[PDB]
Amino acid sequence: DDDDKMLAAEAANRDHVTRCVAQTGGSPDLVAHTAALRLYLRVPHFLTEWTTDPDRRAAVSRALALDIVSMKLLDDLMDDDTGLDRVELACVCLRLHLRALHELESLARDPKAVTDILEQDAVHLCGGQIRTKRSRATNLREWRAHASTYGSTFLGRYGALAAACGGEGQPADSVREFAEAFAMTITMADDLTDYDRNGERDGNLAHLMRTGAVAGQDVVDLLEELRGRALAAVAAPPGAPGLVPVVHLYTDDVLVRLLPRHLGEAGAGAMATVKFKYKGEEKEVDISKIKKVWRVGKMISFTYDEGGGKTGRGAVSEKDAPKELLQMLEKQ
Amino acid sequence: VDDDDKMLAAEAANRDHVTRCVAQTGGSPDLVAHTAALRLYLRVPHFLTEWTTDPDRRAAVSRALALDIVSMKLLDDLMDDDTGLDRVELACVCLRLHLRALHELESLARDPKAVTDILEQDAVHLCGGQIRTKRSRATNLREWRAHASTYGSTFLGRYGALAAACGGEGQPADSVREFAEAFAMTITMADDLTDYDRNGERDGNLAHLMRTGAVAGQDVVDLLEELRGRALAAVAAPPGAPGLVPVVHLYTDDVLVRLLPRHL
């Protein structure tokens, strides 16, 4: 029923943002633009998951949504590619942000916590975005460094804010650790969706992958590093167990749906192989060379291609049977 | 060391505080320069802080205000998009100054919350105002003054209020604000009558309306006289900021003597 809480928070956040944008004078486009920011509107629910009081939780949640959207509008404004009225964007951006400050400050654990947090790393954030758009990334290392400011740092501030405004029992460092790890997962997903949906090439991860400058298996490890970082943060006491399915959901979506659109025939890059002894020999074969395979007890018997018509043959214990060879069993 | 010496040094200090900040966060040399050419916006916080007696607090409140006024001015440039400067730098430096200003103003305020109370209070009037201004352009003195009362008067009045809240001990908060709102309309008109030739501005532009007959010189003269009085009055509520009397006269007379003939 958390899926229901999650959808209801999203709708509350959404409504609170479109009213706000409407009353400030933003056109109906701009209003439809911000209600469309579904993940941005939903993330505040993830960040406030440690918040025991429901009333405080909804108030902090929508205040975060106001600021996150506002920042997204400022980014639209720097790119001049939405078509939207430059003016309405600048004004609606400012108006939402001021409401956010006012709302977050009314719930804070300290009168200076909000501004301290926004200031602490403002330079790393802003000069970071400038360097990101200036010098496009050309390898995983560069890419990850850029994404650590406009992705992780950007969301980590909100993380820190939800802890600052969410009353008692908020493990500050953890909420913030979750936000930074999760934001990078979400940032990769965005990058690999937008190669196509949007038209992005410079410094974009999908391109760097289609180009060779980045190896698939390295993207998989980053994603796995990010998933573990998020899982551990959510595990710190008192814990936000509810976030576990959320972390797996987004991580698995990148792995299973997005990556293949850019690697193709083999995500890993470690073409599976079967090792065995045949006719006194040592042998190893590529799962791609394997024709027929069947099971005899705990043995896996099979046929493969040695070159030309030449039909290869072998049998191994399933205990040494690569997971890939076993998939052809059930699939046969 | 007269009031002029105090003003010039306040201005130089606010400008340097602004450029260090723009530079440390990534601003390019063109952006840093742009930022320093904002003469009056860098000066104006000196006027707003005249009621503050402690000179250390006054210089601190003065530059914290400069950071935000410059910041808003950068967002303004980012919406018009006609300065030929990098939109990414404008948008990033814009946010950085604003965030630093909040942080500096809040650490100076009696009650930190008053900073966001003030900025939220009439955010809708200011922001919806700036949109309508550009949406529906002015055609007679009445409409022009209504628009200007938002991007000019409401815009500076918020800073008057912030300065009273950060200025501390005994400040007639309503009068500081009254002063800023009136003084703001006077300089907005000045700008409008200067920006016509320097920026190629027609629709809703007060100087354009003057040249086409939609607005009469005497009416403009009337408004300026009304604003001078409102400002002079505001600076005389107790305690008082007599220092601003010559300032109010300096900018009002400049509009009457140098700018109007350029149009009538």
Q: Do B129 and B151 touch, CB atoms closer than 8 A?
A: yes
Q: Do A100 and A40 touch, CB atoms closer than 8 A?
A: no
Q: Do A305 and A291 touch, CB atoms closer than 8 A?
A: yes
CB contact under 8 A, A119 and B99: yes
First to last CA, chain B: 39
**Cβ-nearest to A111 among B95, B113, B124:** B113
CB contact under 8 A, A118 and B107: no
DSSP per-residue codes, B169-226: SS--HHHHHHHHHHHHHHHHHHHHHHHHHHHT--TT-HHHHHHTTSS-HHHHHHHHHH
Tokens of B82: 């006609």
Interface test with A, best of B127, B136, B154, B162 (most A CBs within 10 A): B127
Distance CA(B192)–CA(B208), nearest Å, equals: 9
List A294's β-bridge partners, or say none. A301
The two counts, helices (H) then strands (E), for chain A are 14, 5
With b for 16 or more beta-carbon neighbours within 10 A and e for fewer, the A47-60 pattern comes to bbbbbeeeebbbbb
Residue B166 is inside which H or E element, if any?
A: helix B155-167
CB contact under 8 A, B127 and A92: yes
**Resolution as reported, in Å:** 2.5
CB atoms within 10 A of CB B140: 12
CB contact under 8 A, A86 and B79: yes
Distance CA(A98)–CA(B158), nearest Å, equals: 13
Using CA coordinates, name the residue in chain A closest to B135.
A87
The top-level CATH class assigned to B1-264 is mainly alpha
Distance CA(A14)–CA(A20), nearest Å, equals: 10
Tokens of A218: 């390295």
Q: Which amino acid is at B213?
A: G
DSSP per-residue codes, A159-203: HHHHHHHS-SS--HHHHHHHHHHHHHHHHHHHHHHTTTTT---TT
Strand A299-307 versus strand A310-317 pairing type: antiparallel
**Cβ-nearest to B106 among A26, A106, A112:** A112
CB contact under 8 A, B87 and A105: no
Distance CA(A182)–CA(A154), nearest Å, equals: 11
A293: DSSP letter: E
CB < 8 Å to A101, chain B: 102, 116, 119-120
Q: Do B65 and B163 touch, CB atoms closer than 8 A?
A: yes
So where are chain A's domains? 1-269, 270-332
Q: Do A6 and A58 touch, CB atoms closer than 8 A?
A: no
Interface test with B, best of A19, A23, A24, A70 (most B CBs within 10 A): A24
Which residues of B touch chain A, with CB atoms under 8 Å apart?
A: 24-26, 72, 75-76, 78-81, 87-96, 99-100, 102-103, 106-107, 111-113, 116-117, 119-120, 123-124, 127-128, 130-132, 134-135
Experimental technique, in short, is: X-ray
Can you say how many angstroms the Cα of residue A216 is from the centroid of all Cα atoms in its chain?
16
A270-332, CATH topology level: OB fold (Dihydrolipoamide Acetyltransferase, E2P) (2.40.50)
CB < 8 Å to A81, chain B: none
Tokens of B118: 């003030």
Distance from CA of A216 to the nearest CA of B (A): 31
Distance CA(B117)–CA(B123), nearest Å, equals: 10
Tokens of A43: 């993330």
The top-level CATH class assigned to A1-269 is mainly alpha
CA nearest B101: which of B31, B22, B171, B172? B22
How many Cα atoms are found within 13 Å in the side-chain-facing hemisphere of A187? 26
A107: DSSP letter: H
Q: Do B25 and B92 touch, CB atoms closer than 8 A?
A: yes
Using CA coordinates, name the residue in chain A closest to B76.
A90
Distance from CA of B251 to the nearest CA of A (A): 29
Tokens of A203: 């410094």
Tokens of A247: 């972390």
Q: Specify the residue for token string 């003597």.
A: B257
Q: Do B57 and B107 touch, CB atoms closer than 8 A?
A: no
Distance CA(A297)–CA(A93), nearest Å, equals: 67
CB contact under 8 A, B75 and A94: yes
Distance CA(B253)–CA(B250), nearest Å, equals: 6
Q: Do A27 and A85 touch, CB atoms closer than 8 A?
A: yes
Interface test with A, best of B103, B137, B154 (most A CBs within 10 A): B103
CA angle A44/A45/A46 to nearest 5° reads 90
Using CA coordinates, name the residue in chain B closest to A100.
B120
Distance CA(A84)–CA(A77), nearest Å, equals: 9
Q: Specify the residue for token string 């001990």.
A: B169
